C-alpha cells in the first residue's frame, strides 16, 4: 500500500480515534482524517480521495455495520477496504460483518503490530 493512502478513522470516542491515528502514524501512515459516526463518515467520504476506512461497531445515528453496508452498496465507494473494530467479538457480529463485506474485523484494544498485521492481510488480498 502507498504510504500516502488516506484513511478515515470512525469512532464516537475521540480518544479511540486519536489512538488509532497514532498507531497508523507509527506504521508510517500519516494521511488520516476522523469521523464521529456513520453519518459524519459518509459526509466526509463525499469529499473523495479516501482509500481505507477503519470503523468502530457501536456508534449513534449510524453504526459501523450500517456504514459498511452503505459503502458496499454505493457505486463509487463499493471497493473501499473497511476494517471493523469492536469492543467485543460475538459470533453473530462476525458473521454479520462477513455478510456485509467487511475487509477485516479486529477486537480492541490492539497493538500497532496487530493493526499492521490486519492491514497487510487486507492489502495482500486486494493486491494493494
Amino acid at each position: 500500500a502507498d504510504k500516502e493512502l488516506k484513511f478515515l478513522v470512525v469512532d464516537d470516542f475521540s480518544t479511540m480515534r486519536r489512538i488509532v491515528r497514532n498507531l497508523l502514524k507509527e506504521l508510517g501512515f500519516n494521511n488520516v482524517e476522523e469521523a464521529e459516526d456513520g453519518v459524519d463518515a459518509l459526509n466526509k467520504l463525499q469529499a473523495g480521495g479516501f482509500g481505507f476506512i477503519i470503523s468502530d461497531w457501536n456508534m449513534p445515528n449510524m453504526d459501523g455495520l450500517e456504514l459498511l453496508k452503505t459503502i458496499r452498496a454505493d457505486s463509487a465507494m463499493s471497493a473501499l477496504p473497511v476494517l471493523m473494530v469492536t469492543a467485543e467479538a460475538k459470533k453473530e457480529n462476525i458473521i454479520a460483518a462477513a455478510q456485509a463485506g467487511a475487509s477485516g474485523y479486529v477486537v480492541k484494544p490492539f497493538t500497532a503490530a496487530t493493526l499492521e498485521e490486519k492491514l497487510n492481510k487486507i492489502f495482500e488480498k486486494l493486491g494493494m
Binding site: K91, I95, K121
Partner: peptide, 10 residues
C-alpha cells in the same frame, strides 16, 4: 471465536 475469525480470514 478465534477459529471463526481465522476460518473467515479475519
Amino acid at each position: 471465536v478465534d477459529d471463526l475469525l481465522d476460518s473467515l480470514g479475519f
